[PDB]
Amino acid sequence: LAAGAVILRRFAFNAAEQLIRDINDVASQSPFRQMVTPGGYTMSVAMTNCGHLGWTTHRQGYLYSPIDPQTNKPWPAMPQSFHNLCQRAATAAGYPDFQPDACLINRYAPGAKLSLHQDKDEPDLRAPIVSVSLGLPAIFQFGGLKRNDPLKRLLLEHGDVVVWGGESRLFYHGIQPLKAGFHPLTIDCRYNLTFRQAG
Ligand SMILES: O=C(O)CCC(=O)C(=O)O
Ligand SMILES: [Fe+2]
Structure with a gap:
């Protein structure tokens, strides 16, 4: 249960293969990298971005940048497959006007x-x-408006789309260590795309 959240399991099943091809295309321009948090610690999740803006870590904290700090070049453009799926999911969830200008791409290796x-x-x-x-599959956990609120667990599997709006949009959340396994399309990892209006 998550007020404001719209969970569409397997919604992206049909676009999965194409999405993965485009993730590889994006990574060819802006490679996946394990960003370092302001405290000086390497994240276990590897990330990259596509679209006008990209989420990244900085000396002063976190922020969106139109330039990839690693390549010093703009982030790859938002692929069509990405925009099309996001639009359908957003509209289906009740947000037909949602227009993201940033897509953070997370890659989870076993244990990440x-x-x-x-x-x-x-x-x-x-x-x-x-x-x-x-x-x-990965276990997505979330709490409440506070960092010490009751934590709930939700398994997110291949093709699962969730539109985090309303109150859920501000919930503390995370991903538990990825259990080892095999998937025909990603082999040994999990990918997660998050579309945002950062501009
Ligand atoms: O991988 C996930 O399902 C969570 C992604 C997320 O919330 C983030 O990276 O900010
Ligand atoms: Fe997050």
Whole structure:
């Protein structure tokens, strides 16, 4: 249960293969990299971005940049497959006007994890975030408006799309260590795309 959240399991099943081809295309321009947090610690999840803006870590904290700090070049353009799926999911969830200008791409290797955090780097917290999972299943955990609220667990599997809007948009959340396994399309990892209106 998550007020404001719209869970569309297997919604992206049909576009999965194409999405994976485009993730590889994006990674060819802006390679996956394990960003270092302001405290000086390497994240276990590997990331990259496509679209006008990209989420990244900085010395002063977190922020969106139109330039890839590693390549010093713009992030790859938002592929059509990405925009089309996000549009259908957003509209289906009730957000037909949602127009993302950034897509953070996370890659989870076996054991990779993402500790509890809030996504508050966006200008308007009223705009939802569309999440698309691919490959191996992962346990998504979330709490409440506070970092010490009751944590709930939700398994996200290949093709699962969740539109995080309303109150859920501000919930603390994370991903538990990815259990080892095999998937025909991603082999041994999980991918997650999150579309955001960062501009
Ligand atoms: O991988 C996930 O399902 C969570 C992605 C996320 O919330 C983020 O990276 O900010
Ligand atoms: Fe997040």
